[PDB]
Design a binder for this molecule. Sequence first.
Ligand SMILES: CC(C)(C)n1nc(Sc2cccc(Cl)c2)c2c(N)ncnc21
Length: 451
Amino acid sequence: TAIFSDRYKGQRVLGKGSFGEVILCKDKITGQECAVKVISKRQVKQKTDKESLLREVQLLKQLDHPNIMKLYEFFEDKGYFYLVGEVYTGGELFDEIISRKRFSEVDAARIIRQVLSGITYMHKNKIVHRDLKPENLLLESKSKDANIRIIDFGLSTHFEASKKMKDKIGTAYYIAPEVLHGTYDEKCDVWSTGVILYILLSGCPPFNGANEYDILKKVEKGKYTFELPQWKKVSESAKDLIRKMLTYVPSMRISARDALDHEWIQTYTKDVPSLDNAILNIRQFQGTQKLAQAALLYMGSKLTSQDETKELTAIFHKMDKNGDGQLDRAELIEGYKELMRMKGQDASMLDASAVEHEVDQVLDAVEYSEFVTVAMDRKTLLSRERLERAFRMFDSDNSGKISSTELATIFGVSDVDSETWKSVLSEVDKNNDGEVDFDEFQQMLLKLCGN
Ligand SMILES: CC(C)(C)n1nc(Sc2cccc(Cl)c2)c2c(N)ncnc21
């Protein structure tokens, strides 16, 4: 048994992924930068025993492929699992596709050839992804010709999926029908890739709906069509591959290996017009998915900040002996560390030295009542500006407003009941204009999480 904090130190928060938060860490001797996924044992349950998890981790470390994330180390303590691996800076595949001006079948074929090359390799080693989606397709670096890296391969076998809607955004579109009923094998990853290929060439999911349960209903039935006008500009071989990848019965569905030898992958990687209607639809889709996620994370961060404000105020009130409302530096460190000992250690706060630094950063700006307000506003600082940034990206015409039809789509992806947000809208919008600005939209989210 080795300790994580003795080998690695936290540098900055990279983001939130499946089963936990991702941190940019650095080796205290060699100085090698690494991405670390911190899985909380309280929030995430184990689907397998300790000996099964250690055997797969050991295998996953020895595996190597240019389109699969490299895992380096694994650590464990009383309340956490630390998966240490290679860090990628190119960002998510779909976030890059919306920034580029043109996109065609040659670009889509080059993307899916890499995804299949990685999936084929991991299938030969008896490892299944299960939760493959665009969010799990990161680009290795900030370049035009950057390789794709599939992340979280094999973690679904050992960790239970979250039931919280903030952790289930954009999952129902790509999940295979057999995974919903229980009997599934490695062919579920081909379906998930088939769905991604369908969106790359049209910009609309094949199985869609006004809410999570409606999307799963269409997926379970397994029916889709190429009746949208944008499919006329796409080739017949691209559609044939999608037909074979989105076959309902997994035994009849094409394998990852045979999908590489398909005429479409062989012809478009070894005329081709730009798919302009597809890029505009991927841009709208990505913006809608990111605003829905930012809304749920904003509502979540606000709720945790209220709980932590009252808990941190109760800790400092007990420590205040004379009752003057003031405390020393060393006292404030003991109280802030006590919050992590009671309400679970923070992802950014890797050790006691990280807490001492965070307390000093609050004291530079900032009376313990004033210290709580600043310390807790810095926790939400990322989620508040991410919501505003996501609202500005969603509002592509820069009108400053979001229509009622757009709210229904946003709240639909966030799985907020139709009658609940329409009732909350009436509490702020009393003139019924059928549209809201950012402040009004933020006020709706605050009312939805008890404010
Ligand atoms: C985009 C996001 C912040 C979510 N992210 N996700 C990953 S997944 C990962 C990161 C660390 C450990 C394991 Cl098991 C998987 C990851 C990584 N490698 N490098 C940079 N960022 C990463």
